[PDB]
Amino acid sequence: TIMLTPMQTEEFRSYLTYTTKHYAEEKVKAGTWLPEDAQLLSKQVFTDLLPRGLETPHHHLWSLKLNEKDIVGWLWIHAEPEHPQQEAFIYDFGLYEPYRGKGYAKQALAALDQAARSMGIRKLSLHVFAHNQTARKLYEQTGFQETDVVMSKKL
Amino acid sequence: IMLTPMQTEEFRSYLTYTTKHYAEEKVKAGTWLPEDAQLLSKQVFTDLLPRGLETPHHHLWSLKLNEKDIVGWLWIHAEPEHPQQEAFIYDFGLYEPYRGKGYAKQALAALDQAARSMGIRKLSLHVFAHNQTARKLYEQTGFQETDVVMSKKL
Amino acid sequence: TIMLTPMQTEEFRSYLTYTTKHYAEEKVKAGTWLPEDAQLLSKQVFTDLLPRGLETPHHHLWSLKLNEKDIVGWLWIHAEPEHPQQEAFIYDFGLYEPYRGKGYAKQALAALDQAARSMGIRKLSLHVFAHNQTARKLYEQTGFQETDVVMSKKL
Amino acid sequence: IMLTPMQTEEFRSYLTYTTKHYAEEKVKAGTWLPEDAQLLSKQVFTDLLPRGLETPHHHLWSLKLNEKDIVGWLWIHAEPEHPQQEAFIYDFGLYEPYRGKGYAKQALAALDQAARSMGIRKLSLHVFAHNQTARKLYEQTGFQETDVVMSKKL
C-alpha cells in the first residue's frame, strides 16, 4: 500500500541532484550523449523542465510512502489538463536502493493509476531507456505498451 | 452529456478527488481547521454514504460525455416521501480536464430531464460562498438563494 | 471493496433453492438436458456435491458483502489441498439482481484472488455455459483463459 | 526449500492467513475471547510490524520450494546487539497444501544455515501448548522448553 504524498523541499533538492547525475549517465549508456557533454546537457534539461522547482506549473512530484517513516521512492508526472487526450507523462519513477526487490514498484504504479483517474487523466505515457530491461518488463507487466522505438548504429 | 449509474470504480475515483477537494473547500471557507479537514471530510462522506452506492434514496451518477468518456459526477439525495418531492444535490462537478466546455449546463439539463422522469419536483443544493463561478452558473440555470451562512473572525 | 464472509444458514438454504432451479434452466438452455429431466438431474447434482451442506468438506461457500448491511452475492469454490496443482474450482459465483451493473463482480473476483492466495491455492478454474457471453467477457477481462470447449450439433 | 526475502504481495497473503489463524489459536488457547480475537490479532501484528517489511531488525522470508513455488513463511526478530546473538521466531508455517511433506524440517535447516551466516547464535520461539505436532517437531530439531504458561478456569 503505497501512498502518493507531495514531495517536500528537502527530499526534492536531494532528488534533483540524484536525477541530473543519473539522467546524464543513462544518456551516456544509451550512446545519445558524450560523457564530456552529459553534465551540462542534463542540467539544461532539468532546468527547462522545472524552472520553478516544485512550484513549476502542471508538474506533480510525489514521495512514494509506505508509512509515516518510510519514503520508498519518487514519482514525477506532467499533466496539462488542456491536453486533447487528457494524457500525463511520467518523467521519472523509482525506488531508493534499500526498498528495491520487494515488489513496491507495482504497488506504486497501482497507486499512480488510482491517483491519475481521480485527476481525470485518461492515459499514461513514459520514456524508458532501452538498456533498462528490468524497467521495461515491469511496465509490460503493468499494462504499458510500446508505442515508439528509437534505434541507432555506429558505422 | 449523459447520466450513467455510477460504477464502483468510478466511485473510488470520485471519492479520492472529492474528499480532498471538500476539505480544501471547507478550509477556504473557514469552517474547518487544516489539521482537521482531511479527517472530517472522510467522516462526512461515510456519514452520508454508509452503504456506499447502495445507500437508500441516494442517486449517484457518472457524467458521461460520449459512450466511452467520463467527465464528472452528480449525486443527489431524494426522500421518496418528501412533501415537496424535493431532491438535494450533494455533489456535482467535473474533473479538471473537462471544465469550461459547457458540460455543467448540459449536465444540469440532463438532471432536469432525469428528475421529472423520477417524480422529482424540486432541486436544492449547497454551494460555498467563495465559488463565484458555480453561483453564477446556478443563477443562470434558475436556482434562487434560500439561505446564507455568514461568519466573522473577531 | 467486497469481503468474503462464510455463508450463513438462512442465506444458504435460500441460495440452494435458487441454484438448483437456475442450473436446471441453464442446462436446458445449453441443450444438455431436456426440460422434462432437468429438475431431478439438478437436484441429484447438488445433492452429490453438497450432501452435508455448508459442512461439506473442502467446499467454501461465501456471501459477498459490501458492508454489514449489503450481501451483494455468492461465491462457492472447491479446494482439496491434496491437489497436485493446488487448484480450486469455482462451482458458482454471482450477484443478487439489485447489485448488478455497478462493477462489483470484478471486485469480488479480486477478493477471491486474495483469499485464494492466503489459502495457498495456485490456480483457479471454472465452468461457464457458452451462451453466457457476459460472464465469459468478465472472466477474460479478469485473467481467465479458455482451456476446454464442449461443442454440439443437432442433425 | 529456500528462504527468500518476503515480497510485499506475499506479505499481504501471509497477513491474511496468519491474522485469522492467530486469532483462532488464541481462542483455542483460552487467551482471547472470540468476540475480541480478530481485532486483537490485527493489533498485535501492527504493534510488532509497524513499518511492515521495513520494521528494523525483523527478517521476513517466504519459504520457496522450487524457483517458482511458494509454500510458507518464516519471520524472526533479531536485535543486532543482543548479548546472546539470539533471534526470536515470531511466525513460521506452511500453507495447508504443503504440510506433511517434510518442508518444515528443511525450512528449519535452511534457517540454521541462514542464522549462522548472519551472526545469530541462538533461536527462540513461542508455540501454543495445544500444538502437539509443532512441539514434537521443534523437539526433534533441538529446541528445549524454557518457559510454560498454564491456566485454569475456576
Swiss-Prot record, chains B, D:
It comes from Bacillus subtilis (strain 168). InterPro entries: Acyl_CoA_acyltransferase, GNAT_dom, N-acetyltransferase_domain. Its EC number is 2.3.1.-. The keyword DNA repair does not apply. Residues 9-154 form the N-acetyltransferase domain. Homodimer. Keywords: Acyltransferase, Transferase. GO terms for molecular function: acyltransferase activity, transferring groups other than amino-acyl groups. Belongs to the acetyltransferase family. PANTHER family: N-ACETYLTRANSFERASE DOMAIN-CONTAINING PROTEIN (PTHR43259:SF1), SPT10P (PTHR43259). The keyword DNA repair does not apply. It is an enzyme of class 2 (transferase). Pfam families: Acetyltransf_1. This is Uncharacterized N-acetyltransferase YycN.
